[model samples]
Target chain A: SNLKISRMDKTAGSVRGGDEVYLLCDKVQKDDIEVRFYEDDENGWQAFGDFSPTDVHKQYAIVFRTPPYHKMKIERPVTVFLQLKRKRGGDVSDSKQFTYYPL
Target chain B: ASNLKISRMDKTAGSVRGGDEVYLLCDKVQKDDIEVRFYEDDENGWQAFGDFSPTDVHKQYAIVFRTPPYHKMKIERPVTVFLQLKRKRGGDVSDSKQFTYYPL
Candidate 1:
């Protein structure tokens, strides 16, 4: 099956505390796909969410908790990585950055 | 100097869910009386979000947002946003803006 994935914010403004982040993809091979989220740390690319999809063939919304208290304590302008696995196995994609600014 | 600040609820409220369209408007503010106006395009068109007078010395302001449904498309799309304030008889220039939302 053909597949693609990327990060998306729920709105146009600054990403707040409880806004859900989504991984939009096309023709997802749910049975064979594994989605992973990683935040940068002193050790680099620390994995956060490592789970398989309960639903497939559609966009995936991975809701994120508020920052400042996140396990990684993501400072403003942090980079997160999403790795995808398929039937033939896969390669890592470029990192996506999440900018969190305080009021 | 006087200014207006609008923040969204830290969590998502199911009540405002809808088709994939997003818009931000001024809600409330602190200390001084404020007049909120919508900024349309670069020149700053005249659309009003709201006007407010403080009942107390400090009331934190929040934003009212329109949550849109997801769209299935070939590539991601981004929306631009800006906030303007009414100062005296004129409005402040659109100096604050942010862009987000990308399709997978």
Candidate 2:
């Protein structure tokens, strides 16, 4: 199936620590699907961490708490990419960007 | 000192079943330290259920969540609950707005 991220709950904001964020995407495989984030910069891709969705809806919607922003540079806003990781076929879905404002 | 205020909410003053999506639109000075919560008005004053997060969908500064299944007490008629936003662990920011929930 074609894996694509059409839309998500939050796209922009100064999300502080422990805020819950939901992501909506096109349907994809369901088994062992995990969400990971990336920060694109001069260093290329920096893997933030893998996230477990608080709620999952048959590959259509996911609810996960935003990773803590403690390690994020508070100097300015940062943009991060989100993608899905599937155990089978080791497939990685398309990426989407979420901007976090400085705390 | 920052005072976060919730001026209004969308779908305000509407009838709803047990499980329904609610959107809270608000005007605040600061978004930090804010959490949305629902309170049931009964003889026991204001009873708080749980704190909810704002949708922040493209920075709308609004909260979106489904109404809990049912209150502890089931009522044949509709009951009123107050929806308000405030600090994670602080007093209510302003007056509690009425959100009427009907039994499913």
Candidate 3:
């Protein structure tokens, strides 16, 4: 796919999640996209960023919430990776980094 | 020609002292002429423009701008206000969107 993520308003959020994120990207079909967060460790942790289709602006930007960390009580900040993935055609974009902070 | 419209914004609330970054998505716009107008009145009003450079306008469809400082910085709670996309030359504008400023 030609999908690409240009920027994100905030790169780090809380471990308990529910942090708002503004993502700028190449054009996408609003209903067919998902933001995937993952860790490349042997742990295989992954989750989908959450937002409504209406949250996608035109076809270039998305306002979404960060998913909760795999573990809530982590002592130190954890950095993870995120990417734009399509739901239907199963295409994915290059990944970006996000950090989750413990409260 | 289609009308100028703000389709979505990254943030709806910011510090009363402003300076928060806002990523706004909109319909086609003139990168050099468009401004985000923050206003409050119930017209003896307070108004300011969002701060951004012409290069900050992304591809004519998105903009990255900073919120202007609110007129009053000492508010005790959240104060709701309105903002709109306006042109510098012709003075035309789009519909307003609600924004809130909160005390630090």
Candidate 4:
């Protein structure tokens, strides 16, 4: 099955470490999905860290707190791409971009 | 039946421009069968946001949601709103408290 993330609550935000965020989608099981934050460059997709959606059992939504983007050594308040993956079946969703502002 | 009671909310005041999210912690026995609605203090009466269930992030006692954008309002200023919680169709509801939103 294909996973589609139709909308996000906040597109551009001054998100910081410990700040919570919500991602809304229609299809996908919460428990079987994982979220990754990717930064684009000449080197290809670079993952932020071990970040995953917290409320994984929900059928329509996933909630997570913002990880420390600064500690990842990326630029302050930069735009990053997000990919959702299924742990058991190896399904990857299309990437969505969001902005991270400096704390 | 007695209605649910709200113990406290993480934030009582937030951005008037309204993109901020907050966690609401309540004291409820039946957690999954509840629905939360929003109401502004003025002309509009109680408007339903949507039906949401508690997740791991909420610890079964809390829920999180973003504040509605005020682009429809002609004047941008601080607005007071209240959240009411009830059963899916119709049942006991909480007598929620007030929250103030400030514009950008």
Candidate 3: fraction of native contacts reproduced: 0.50
Rank the candidate models, highest DockQ first.
3, 4, 2, 1
Q: Which portions of model 1 miss their true places by more than 4 Å?
A: A1-3, A10-19, A39-42, A50-52, A57-77, A99-103, B1-104
> In what order do the candidates fall by TM-score, top score first?
3, 4, 2, 1
Chain A of model 1 scored by TM-score: 0.45
lDDT of 3 by residue, A1-103 (tens): 5789887889998998899888888889998999999999898899988999988887888889989997899999999999998985679889889999988
- Clashing residue pairs, backbone N/CA/C < 3 A, model 3: none
Across A5-99, the per-residue lDDT of candidate 4 in tens digits comes to 65454566554555555555556775577766767777565443243544532455565655655444445667888877786667877888877
Maximum-TM-score candidate: 3
* Candidate 4 Cα misplacement greater than 4 A, ranges: A13-16, A42-54, A70-77, B1-12, B15-81, B85-98, B102-104
Instruction: Give residue A102's lDDT in candidate 1 (0 to 100).
Output: 37
What's model 3's lDDT at B72?
A: 83
Q: After superposition, how far is residue A29 of candidate 1 from its true place, in Å?
A: 1.3
| CAPRI class assigned to model 3 | medium
Alpha carbon lDDT of each predicted model: 0.37, 0.55, 0.89, 0.60
Q: lDDT by residue for model 3 over B13-96, one digit each (tens)?
A: 999889999988899888888899999875658998899998778767889999999988998779999999998788889989
| Cα RMSDs, all models | 18.8, 15.7, 2.6, 7.7
lDDT of 4 at B89: 52
Which candidate would rank higher by lDDT, 2 or 3? 3
